[PDB]
Amino acid sequence: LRQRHTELEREVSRFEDQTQQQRQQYAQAKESLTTLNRLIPQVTLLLDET
Amino acid sequence: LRQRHTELEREVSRFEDQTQQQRQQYAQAKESLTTLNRLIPQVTLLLDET
Amino acid sequence: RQGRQYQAEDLEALQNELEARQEALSLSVNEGGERRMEMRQELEQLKQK
Amino acid sequence: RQGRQYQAEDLEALQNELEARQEALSLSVNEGGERRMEMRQELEQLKQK
Description:
This is part of a larger assembly, with four copies of chain A.
Chain A: H1 2-39, H2 44-47
């Protein structure tokens, strides 16, 4: 059971790393979305060699 | 424990509902936002009601 | 969809505000979403017990 | 700000990529939180044993 606890701690560390990463990139992606969705979403019409 | 189950179920029901409504409102928020994203960027200015 | 005239002649600024409103989405859906999750396990645990 | 360059000829691809990932956002946060807290209670049962 002590080994079980050791491996459980290992898994805790892995999950912590994964969660911090994924949430950070997801926030950044949300921000980039906001930019595109708000500003760009259709203005390519105008950008289209008008 | 069965009483605990019933009470936890009450609480979980409340959260399930709150989510069920909430998401409607906030999906509608992003939806109206998409409507604005479609309208304003240039369309409101060429469809400026000339 | 929004109001019924809703200053459509010139709504510009509100778009920004709407985005602000939309931010609450994150919390309002996110929070309970784990709460259910959370208690569900306990229910499961309690079930197991 | 993001990437390095993407053809103005197609915004839609970027829209769809971000759509997919932001859809994965909620799922990923649920995954992380639930699995970690569940294995934490597992830790607790191990402790008592």
